[PDB]
Amino acid sequence: MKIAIAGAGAMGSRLGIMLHQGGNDVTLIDQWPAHIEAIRKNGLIADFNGEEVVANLPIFSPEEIDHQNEQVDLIIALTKAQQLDAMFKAIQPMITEKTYVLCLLNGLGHEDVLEKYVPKENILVGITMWTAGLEGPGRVKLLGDGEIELENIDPSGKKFALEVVDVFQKAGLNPSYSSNVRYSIWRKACVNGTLNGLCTILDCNIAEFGALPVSESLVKTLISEFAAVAEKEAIYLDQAEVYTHIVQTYDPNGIGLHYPSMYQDLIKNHRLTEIDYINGAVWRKGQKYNVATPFCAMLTQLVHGKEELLGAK
Amino acid sequence: AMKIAIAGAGAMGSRLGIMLHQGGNDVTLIDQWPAHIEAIRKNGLIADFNGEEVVANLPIFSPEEIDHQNEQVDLIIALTKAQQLDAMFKAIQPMITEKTYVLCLLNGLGHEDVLEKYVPKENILVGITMWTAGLEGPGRVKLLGDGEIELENIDPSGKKFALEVVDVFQKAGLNPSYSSNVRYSIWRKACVNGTLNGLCTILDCNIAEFGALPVSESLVKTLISEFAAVAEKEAIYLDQAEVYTHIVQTYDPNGIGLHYPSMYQDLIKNHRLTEIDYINGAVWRKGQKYNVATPFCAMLTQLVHGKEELLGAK
Ligand SMILES: [Mg+2]
């Protein structure tokens, strides 16, 4: 298999090394100049389970890709959501009608960007439980075990999804085909589409939010909107268990006393949030599917208003 | 001679009471303030009325005292704040018959929905009072200046009696007029107050700061649309463009742009409970009964109530 890894961060580097070792043609694409230079000069150097592994993998920045580059069977997308479109536009010369994409991004709706570059039937989604650390440019620390669960988003993509599993198996990645990955991503986005935005706007921690008399109605209204949109994509969220899952976070002996990650980005660090890929994505989908998602719409607008007020970058 | 009960005998109710008494009407005061009841029972209601002392020996009762031995009245004038209106009208029911009308003088939206539990819906009038009144002490008010009252029947059957109330108020010197814009102006005002108030409160910012946001147009217009959708069901047709234009004009730092709206001062400055239930909460309540979606009103109401709880507002 010819594989391009779009985003050669810690996870991308792990996957690249392992797939290389498994006998595949691997090309890295990355936006960190020092990292690129280091890999070009000394190879990708991994502290891989106490053993040094050096892999001489081709690497390019997106601006360097053109017609001359080799075409690939699979692109593994690790590029963060806000650079995804730009990354895929750059690597277009490497894509044919037969090219598949495995999207390993967090959050929702990435297939709307990806379908501009690749048929929908060619899109796979995955979750990785591997860990990885970058020690510096061209150097990664790889420890522990893990696995990758993946799923075709379109029923025509099943055969190739199984072929990616086989490739990943021979590379030691511990893959499985799972009919639950899209559901788990939807379910997680639900969690991230409640506490994140609501704590950020109201300015409070998780247990403080949970204790509000309005918390039940706000959370449940938001879950229902995620569920209404997900249903159009043949994902049927268990709304009662999603609610039970969120209610458990309120426990002060658990993470109750923590502030959610969106609070940390915006309120603590004045950085732009992930809202466009959570409630913003449900809203975008609702608009295309003629499903009303007003709480997601308003929460998205309020968070964007708050970002601008705090001069978030 | 109309029999008139004043529900809420504060400074304004006291003005109306005295003046309607001077016009020869049969006035009864209803009030929740014990010291006020005691002073009025001892010495009558005392007004410093344009530099002259006027005393009016009016009957006065607390709501809990009212029973079927009390007089049944032609008109109740409602001035009790919204938070106590329901309990006030439940208590004064013994004074209401099928022929009793209410003139609601409260600020804000949707009070007819409480009143109609106690007074026939056909008999509800709404008005705006431009008079001023001050409270000097229990049973003692200070009345200066001029004013007027504009009023309107809510139900088309209430028109003749509304006109009769105007006549009564005219003779009492209250400068009344019948106005077919009263309900509209109340809706338009609530619409304005249903945007910047909750939004600046939740986001923590002033009016111009809010206005400049790239989401200000979308937030404001969606909220306006919800107000208009529900008003339409009650045969009030809001000019959504005019309302938006008014809101944009508030962004001007030469005008009120640098100010914070009243709800912000209530909650964010003073840690006091907001009026949200009688603005966005009222649109939301009506929308539910009319099968009209009002989700921005609903969410904004819940967020404001959320913030009240977080700040320990009282
Ligand atoms: Mg700005």
DSSP string, B119-162: S-GGGEEEEEE----EEEETTEEEE-S---EEEEESSGGGHHHH
Delimit the domains of chain A by residue range: 2-179, 180-313
How many A/B residue pairs have CB atoms within 8 Å? 76
Rg (CA), chain B: 21
Q: Is B229 an 8 Å CB contact of chain A?
A: no
Which residue among A212, A299, A306 places its CB closest to the CB of B309?
A: A212
A270 CA to centre of ligand 1 in angstroms: 13
d(CA B38, CA B138): 8
d(CA B137, CA A109): 65
Which chain A residues are within 8 Å of B309, Cβ to Cβ? 211-214
Show the tokens assigned to A74. 């699979």
d(CA B25, CA B2): 5
Alpha helices in chain A (DSSP H): 10-21, 33-42, 81-91, 111-114, 158-170, 181-192, 195-202, 206-210, 215-232, 239-248, 261-263, 279-289, 294-309
CA atoms within 13 A on the CB side of B120: 13
- Residue A253 burial (C-beta neighbours within 10 Å; 0-12, 13-18, 19+): exposed
Whole-angstrom CA distances from A109 to A8, A12, A259, A278, A313 are: 22, 21, 25, 9, 23
- Count other Cβ atoms within 10 Å, centred on residue A288: 11
Q: Do A94 and A69 form a contact (C-beta atoms < 8 A)? A: yes
d(CA A199, CA A265): 12
SS3 A151: strand
Q: Do B268 and B194 form a contact (C-beta atoms < 8 A)? A: no
d(CA A241, CA A247): 10
d(CA A64, CA A33): 12
Distance of CA A165 to the CA centre of its chain: 19
First to last CA, chain B: 43
d(CA B111, CA B275): 13
Q: Do A55 and A49 form a contact (C-beta atoms < 8 A)? A: no
Residue of B nearest to A300 (CA): B215
> B117-121 long-range CB contacts below 8 Å, 24 or more apart?
B117/B86, B117/B89, B117/B90, B118/B89, B118/B90, B118/B92, B118/B93, B119/B76, B119/B89, B121/B154, B121/B155
Distance of CA A121 to the CA centre of its chain: 19
First to last CA, chain A: 40
A7 strand-pairing partners: none
**Pairing between β-strand B124-129 and β-strand B101-104 as defined by DSSP bridges:** parallel
- Residue B245 burial (C-beta neighbours within 10 Å; 0-12, 13-18, 19+): exposed
Q: Is B218 an 8 Å CB contact of chain A?
A: yes
Residue whose C-alpha is closest to residue B106's, from B90, B88, B120? B88
Which residue among A214, A295, A309 places its CB closest to the CB of B209?
A: A309
Q: Is A203 an 8 Å CB contact of chain B?
A: yes
d(CA B133, CA B258): 30
Rg (CA), chain A: 20
| Residue among B203, B300, B304 with most chain A CBs within 10 A, to mutate | B203
| Residue among A201, A302, A303, A306 with most chain B CBs within 10 A, to mutate | A302
Cβ contact (<8 Å) for B302 and A202? no
Instruction: Supply the angle between the helices A181-192 and A195-202 in degrees, to the nearest 10.
Output: 10
| Residue among B200, B213, B304 with most chain A CBs within 10 A, to mutate | B213
The set of catalytic residues of B is 189
Alpha helices in B8-97 (DSSP H): 11-22, 34-43, 82-92
Cβ contact (<8 Å) for A214 and B296? no
Q: Do A112 and A90 form a contact (C-beta atoms < 8 A)? A: no
d(CA B62, CA B60): 7
**Residue A253 identity:** N
Q: What is the CATH number of domain A2-179?
A: 3.40.50.720
Which chain B residues are within 8 Å of A305, Cβ to Cβ? 203, 210, 213, 215-216, 219
Phi, psi of A127 (to 5 degrees): -125, 135
d(CA A269, CA A202): 16
Which chain B residues are within 8 Å of A308, Cβ to Cβ? 213-215
Which chain B residues are within 8 Å of A213, Cβ to Cβ? 305, 309
Q: Do B84 and B254 form a contact (C-beta atoms < 8 A)? A: no
Which residues, in sequence order, are CB contacts of A207 under 8 Å at separation 6+? A250, A251, A252, A256, A257
Phi, psi of A55 (to 5 degrees): -120, 120
Q: Do B30 and B6 form a contact (C-beta atoms < 8 A)? A: yes
Show the tokens assigned to B23. 């016009």
CATH class of the region A180-313: mainly alpha
d(CA B248, CA B232): 23
Residue whose C-alpha is closest to residue A153's, from A84, A90, A235, A221? A235
Show the tokens assigned to A59. 């690497």
Give the CA angle between residues B234, B239, B245 to the nearest 5°: 140
Whole-angstrom CA distances from A297 to A303, A304, B302 are: 10, 11, 15
Which chain A residues are within 8 Å of B209, Cβ to Cβ? 309
Give the single-character DSSP code of B71: P
Which residues, in sequence order, are CB contacts of A39 under 8 Å at separation 6+? A8, A28, A57, A59, A137, A138
SS3 A22: coil
Q: What is the CATH number of domain B1-180?
A: 3.40.50.720
SS3 B192: helix
Q: Do A202 and B310 form a contact (C-beta atoms < 8 A)? A: yes
For the CA atoms of B214, B220, B223, B229, the dihedral, rounded to the nearest 10 degrees, stands at -120
d(CA A81, CA A185): 15
Q: Is A306 an 8 Å CB contact of chain B?
A: yes
d(CA A261, CA A253): 18
> B127-131 long-range CB contacts below 8 Å, 24 or more apart?
B127/B103, B127/B151, B127/B152, B127/B182, B128/B182, B128/B185, B128/B186, B129/B12, B129/B16, B129/B105, B131/B12, B131/B15, B131/B174
Instruction: Supply the angle between the helices B240-250 and B216-233 in degrees, to the nearest 10.
Output: 140
Bin A311: left if φ > 0, else alpha if -120 < ψ < 50, else beta.
left
Phi, psi of B113 (to 5 degrees): -75, -30
Q: Is B284 an 8 Å CB contact of chain A?
A: no
Phi, psi of A170 (to 5 degrees): -65, -20
Helix, strand, coil share of chain A (percent; to 5): 50, 15, 35
Instruction: Supply the angle between the helices A215-232 and B295-311 in degrees, to the nearest 10.
Output: 140
Residue whose C-alpha is closest to residue B137's, from B7, B8, B11, B6? B11
A254 CA to centre of ligand 1 in angstroms: 37
CA atoms within 13 A on the CB side of B109: 28
Q: Is A221 an 8 Å CB contact of chain B?
A: yes
| Token pair 């020869």: residue | B24
Which residues, in sequence order, are CB contacts of A228 under 8 Å at separation 6+? A286, A291, A292, A293
Q: Is B221 an 8 Å CB contact of chain A?
A: no
What kind of fold does domain B181-314 have according to CATH? N-(1-d-carboxylethyl)-l-norvaline Dehydrogenase; domain 2 (1.10.1040)
d(CA B168, CA B23): 8
- Count other Cβ atoms within 10 Å, centred on residue A40: 15
Which chain B residues are within 8 Å of A201, Cβ to Cβ? 202-203, 303
Give the CA angle between residues A93, A94, A100 to the nearest 5°: 130
Residue of A nearest to B205 (CA): A309
Whole-angstrom CA distances from B13 to A127, A274, B40, B91, B109 are: 68, 54, 13, 18, 20
Which chain A residues are within 8 Å of B296, Cβ to Cβ? 294, 298
SS3 B307: helix
| Token pair 């001007």: residue | B252
Q: Do B126 and B24 form a contact (C-beta atoms < 8 A)? A: no
| Residue among A259, A293, A299, A308 with most chain B CBs within 10 A, to mutate | A308
Give the CA angle between residues B229, B214, A229 to the nearest 5°: 60
A141 strand-pairing partners: A47, A133
Which residues, in sequence order, are CB contacts of A8 under 8 Å at separation 6+? A16, A28, A29, A30, A32, A35, A39, A44, A59, A78
Residue of B nearest to A221 (CA): B299
Give the single-character DSSP code of B268: I
A305 CA to centre of ligand 1 in angstroms: 9
B103 strand-pairing partners: B77, B125
- In chain A, DSSP finds a helix count (H) and a strand count (E) of 13, 12
Give how far B215 is from chain A: nearest CA, Å. 6
Distance of CA B37 to the CA centre of its chain: 23
Q: Is A272 an 8 Å CB contact of chain B?
A: no
